[PDB]
Design an enzyme around this catalytic site. Sequence first.
Site, PDB file in Angstrom:
ATOM      1  N   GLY A  73       0.794  -1.214   0.000  1.00 57.51           N
ATOM      2  CA  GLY A  73       0.000   0.000   0.000  1.00 57.51           C
ATOM      3  C   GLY A  73       0.828   1.266   0.000  1.00 57.51           C
ATOM      4  NE  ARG A  74       4.502   4.788  -2.447  1.00 60.77           N
ATOM      5  CZ  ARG A  74       4.683   4.061  -3.543  1.00 60.77           C
ATOM      6  NH1 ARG A  74       3.848   4.136  -4.566  1.00 60.77           N
ATOM      7  NH2 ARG A  74       5.733   3.247  -3.616  1.00 60.77           N
ATOM      8  N   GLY A  75      -0.882   5.638   0.131  1.00 59.05           N
ATOM      9  CA  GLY A  75      -0.180   5.951   1.359  1.00 59.05           C
ATOM     10  C   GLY A  75      -0.217   7.439   1.663  1.00 59.05           C
ATOM     11  CB  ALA A  76      -1.106  10.238   0.864  1.00 59.24           C
ATOM     12  CG  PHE A  77       0.565  10.991   5.628  1.00 58.41           C
ATOM     13  CD1 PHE A  77       0.871  12.246   5.127  1.00 58.41           C
ATOM     14  CD2 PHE A  77      -0.629  10.815   6.306  1.00 58.41           C
ATOM     15  CE1 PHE A  77       0.001  13.307   5.300  1.00 58.41           C
ATOM     16  CE2 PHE A  77      -1.502  11.869   6.484  1.00 58.41           C
ATOM     17  CZ  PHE A  77      -1.188  13.117   5.981  1.00 58.41           C
ATOM     18  CD  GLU A  79       6.848   2.181   0.225  1.00 58.83           C
ATOM     19  OE1 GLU A  79       7.541   1.556   1.058  1.00 58.83           O
ATOM     20  OE2 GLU A  79       7.134   2.245  -0.991  1.00 58.83           O
ATOM     21  CE  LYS A  95       0.144   5.087   6.031  1.00 60.44           C
ATOM     22  NZ  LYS A  95       0.283   5.366   4.573  1.00 60.44           N
ATOM     23  CG  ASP A 188     -11.894   7.342   6.146  1.00 56.36           C
ATOM     24  OD1 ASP A 188     -12.399   8.008   5.215  1.00 56.36           O
ATOM     25  OD2 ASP A 188     -10.837   6.673   6.033  1.00 56.36           O
TER      26      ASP A 188
END
EC number: 2.7.11.1
Lengths: 389, 389
Positions: A73-77, A79, A95, A188
């Site tokens: 995964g990723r992520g934006a902040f 991985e 994370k 969310d």
Amino acid sequence: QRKLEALIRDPRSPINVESLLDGLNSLVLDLDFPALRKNKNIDNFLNRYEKIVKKIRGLQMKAEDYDVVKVIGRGAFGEVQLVRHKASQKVYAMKLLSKFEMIKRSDSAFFWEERDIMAFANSPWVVQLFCAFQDDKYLYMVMEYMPGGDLVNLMSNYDVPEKWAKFYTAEVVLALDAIHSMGLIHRDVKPDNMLLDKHGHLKLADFGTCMKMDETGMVHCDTAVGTPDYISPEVLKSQGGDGYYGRECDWWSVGVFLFEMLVGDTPFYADSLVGTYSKIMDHKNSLCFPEDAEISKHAKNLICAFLTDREVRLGRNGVEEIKQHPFFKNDQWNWDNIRETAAPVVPELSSDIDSSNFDDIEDDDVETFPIPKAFVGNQLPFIGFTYYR
Amino acid sequence: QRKLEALIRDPRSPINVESLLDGLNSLVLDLDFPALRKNKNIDNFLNRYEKIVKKIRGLQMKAEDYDVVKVIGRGAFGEVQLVRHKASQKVYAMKLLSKFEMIKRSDSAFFWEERDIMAFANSPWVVQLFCAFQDDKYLYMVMEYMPGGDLVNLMSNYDVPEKWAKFYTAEVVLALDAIHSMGLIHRDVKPDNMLLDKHGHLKLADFGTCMKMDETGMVHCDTAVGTPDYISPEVLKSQGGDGYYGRECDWWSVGVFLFEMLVGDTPFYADSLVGTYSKIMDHKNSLCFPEDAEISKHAKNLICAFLTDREVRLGRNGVEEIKQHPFFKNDQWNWDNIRETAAPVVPELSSDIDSSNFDDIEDDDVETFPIPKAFVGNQLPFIGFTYYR
């Protein structure tokens, strides 16, 4: 000395040993820049404690303790990487959270606490935190691995029938009631956060959105989620203001989830981010079911019971009236025992690092704090973040 | 996670709990100023720990636990007071060290290392440190009360015959040997630092002069003074250059002590300071005994064996040759038993707070750090200073 060692002992206290280590470790990082060392006292301090501080960082908990198997995964902040703690041979999902990027610009706290009060509850409906540590550039969160993937990948791989939709909806409802009983609301709920375990059973994951409630049962924060396909009107209204919504924002999400699972698209889909927001705001008028896609009256009734004004929405009298809904009649499970029945989709996991239920991810180069001139103290907000099972 | 807890546990370690709590407490003291708190990170951090910090500071050992019986000394850095711990009802002597006056005079170090070496070695010849702590203004050292006063007082009250001087010199010799064995040189041996206990026996006290040695046992610097009348010629020339000295500077001071104790004046006394320095540099020529003041040919010999150039001075081949000097003959004491024999002056002491062997004192002061405009870390050098037995 009486109560002192007790404050240090309590692992929930903000001045236990690993917080004191975090504190001293942070203070070093915020002073070791060649501009600040012009000050007599700052230089002497580093020269003494520098040696022993790196010996600590060596023994504590570190990215090198783990093997990066594959990036899931990723992520934006950061991985989501599948890791294997070399010492324990155990498999986890980790994370990475870039600091700096984690300075969402206005007020913060403490920050964690939501994730703290979840971990110390250990619900089997919530993806579980084991270890949590940090270095100069990242926060690290070591979670239990969910090798069945998320429900985005499930819906893109199957024509979900109503028999399955009952099951996955029910387990989400039981997960939200669990989180609500901890005093939290998720804000969310989307298929990204619905993850399946070894057996095909669902857990919810917090991507940093959960928040602890008022004594009115409300929360009033400010802080967002970006894409809104699953977000309720009361949350969208409040990003401008504050603006106090209750736990019933999560039940709107369950309705969106059930629509997408039975229809194929989200109810308020639109090319533009604008168009989706305006369509969600105009939900009394925009919600409709495609001409073809055949859906039972019970299922269509439940979706509409969740996708209404929060005044009359299903489940603001408690979760019991969600369980009573006729759509949840079935020959296979009781709400009493659903997590030990057979799941609809059991993953075909061949090894303990099988990640075939996660899409591959390219290698994207990271941004960090500016080098300061005078003391700015970037690291102080993470004093107390380190956490050990 | 094995010998990490070993590091915190061991009180020899530089980062036990005291050093971590010192670390945090200084971090708060240096950051809580209205100027630096325009920073959001710093303000956020303070709001979180501010309260729980004042709690610890209250729990920790603190100047209020001690009643102040009387001031017995001073003390260009702070007074020395006879105190009584309230919970334990016990009597100690407490030095105050103004933090403001400690950074200026001088660099750096550490310091308080020397005293850890001395405390954890616990020689019966060295005044024993018990507790050591700090607040925002002062340092505090709780040591054993020496109720018999110093030897300045004794020599000013008695014409000291040779049979007394044999005793006191012998105990100074055994005391310096203890300090030397620990890898320390005193650099400040003078009657002021020689204190007498309840029984009339003698201990040396560090007034912040003891320094840790070479790989051989001989290190340099200045810094420094010793004190004008008692400084050796090597320490005096040593302000740069080929300036480098070892334990043999203390043995010069023993000889000066024995001259004053038997003659009534110091061998290099002068009106001015530069008069004493010039006499000391000219010691081959300026040392001479008043013809009358009767000194056994042995006391003259020992004095002159100490008061010569460092490379022919008694004590360069170890202490064993000091012990077999004709002066130290007597029937009262051996060298292995002297501290359990009758001292020549036992002070009759009426209570446990009797302070009649210390002169009266007064004249107010107080003075501390200018308020910072940015971070300067005026409390960093004292991290790790807190000590308990």
